[PDB]
Structure formats: C-alpha cells, structure tokens
C-alpha cells in the first residue's frame, strides 16, 4: 500500500480550495447540470445506442417469427 508523500513528483502547481461551509452544495444544479447531461449524451450516443437498437430489432423479429410459425397453415 502506497502513502502520501511517496506517490510522485510535482512542481509549480497551485491549488485554491474553499471551505465546504463557505459555498453551495448544489450550485446551479439545474441551470448548469442539464446542459452538461445533454453534452455527455451526444458525445457517446453513437457508440452505445446502435448495438442495443440492433438487439431490439432482432428481439422483435425473432418473437414475431416464433409466434407465426406456431400457428397452423391450411393444408
């Protein structure tokens, strides 16, 4: 297990932090959050969606075909 003070080397980097009792826990939750969700959805929709759309079409066709095959045809 590693420990702080032995992780890596860093130089010339300043970090400004504010106390949690000094700031909001939900700053602009909807006024800023909803735009960010839409940005992230657009960036990944084309990678995630087409596979499951392909599943949905194969699912419905296979179920429709299985239903029709079980119904008899006139001789």
């Amino acid at each position: 297990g590693r420990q702080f003070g032995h992780l890596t080397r860093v130089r010339h980097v300043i970090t400004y932090s504010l106390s949690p009792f000094e700031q909001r826990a939900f700053p602009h939750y909807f006024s800023k959050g909803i735009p960010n969700v839409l940005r992230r959805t657009r960036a990944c929709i084309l990678r995630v969606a087409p596979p499951f759309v392909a599943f949905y079409l194969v699912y419905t066709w296979g179920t429709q075909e299985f239903e029709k095959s079980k119904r008899k045809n006139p001789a």
Binding site: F4, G5, L7, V10, S17, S19, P20, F21
Partner: peptide, 13 residues
Amino acid sequence: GPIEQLPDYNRIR
C-alpha cells in the same frame, strides 16, 4: 513546498 502529505481541507476542518 513538498506538501503532498498536507492533509485534505476536510480532514483539517
């Protein structure tokens, strides 16, 4: 300085 081990502000608080 070399302040990697400086505790987090929440931990200080």
